[PDB]
């Protein structure tokens, strides 16, 4: 029904492509220069690797929940809005919210 996105800013992108390839025993679903991503069935996960200006070690760029269709995005938007969370809308079709310590979540569609 839905799935976690984990987006890492890494210092060596090739290295990492290799690594997570072995860690999950699968290959990247898309590779572009300066970014690659993985659709992992088990564990269910969308791993985005973004490559970053050689600044020391990997940082967590952002987090997210990947859902199945546009309705669910809308629905969550309503739900987080009513629970009281600062929502920001990015235009079809995603919604951002932010943890107290600043970590950003994006609820979106594939």
């Amino acid at each position: 029904m839905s799935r976690v996105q984990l987006a890492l800013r890494v210092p060596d992108l090739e290295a990492s492509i290799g690594f997570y390839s072995k860690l999950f025993g699968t290959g990247p679903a898309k590779v572009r220069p300066g970014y690659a991503n993985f659709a992992i069935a088990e564990p269910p996960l969308k791993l985005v690797l973004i490559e970053g200006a050689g600044e020391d070690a990997t940082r967590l760029d952002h987090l997210g929940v990947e859902v199945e269709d546009s309705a669910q995005v809308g629905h969550a938007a309503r739900r987080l809005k009513e629970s009281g969370l600062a929502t920001v809308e990015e235009n079809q079709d995603k919604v951002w919210v932010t943890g107290p310590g600043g970590e950003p979540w994006e609820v979106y569609v594939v």
Side-chain angles (χ1 to χ4, degrees), residues 2-29 31 33-54 56-58 60-67 69-80 82-90 93-110:
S2 85
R3 212 146 73 114
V4 200
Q5 193 197 46
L6 169 65
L8 299 175
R9 202 154 73 255
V10 298
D12 192 327
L13 184 56
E14 197 36 66
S16 285
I17 281 168
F19 168 81
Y20 285 103
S21 256
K22 321 190 149 176
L23 182 65
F24 301 112
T26 159
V31 179
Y35 96 81
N37 62 34
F38 291 82
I40 320 291
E42 302 296 315
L45 166 60
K46 189 74 206 193
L47 181 64
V48 171
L49 316 177
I50 311 142
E51 205 242 324
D56 207 350
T58 304
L60 150 64
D61 193 280
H62 68 288
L63 286 163
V65 180
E66 196 179 273
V67 308
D69 59 40
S70 330
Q72 304 175 305
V73 170
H75 179 76
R78 187 63 167 179
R79 205 178 46 67
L80 306 166
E82 263 148 33
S83 43
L85 287 169
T87 272
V88 177
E89 317 247 6
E90 188 183 352
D93 197 2
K94 49 177 94 183
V95 51
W96 292 93
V97 301
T98 306
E103 69 287 5
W105 291 77
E106 158 197 31
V107 176
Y108 69 101
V109 193
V110 248

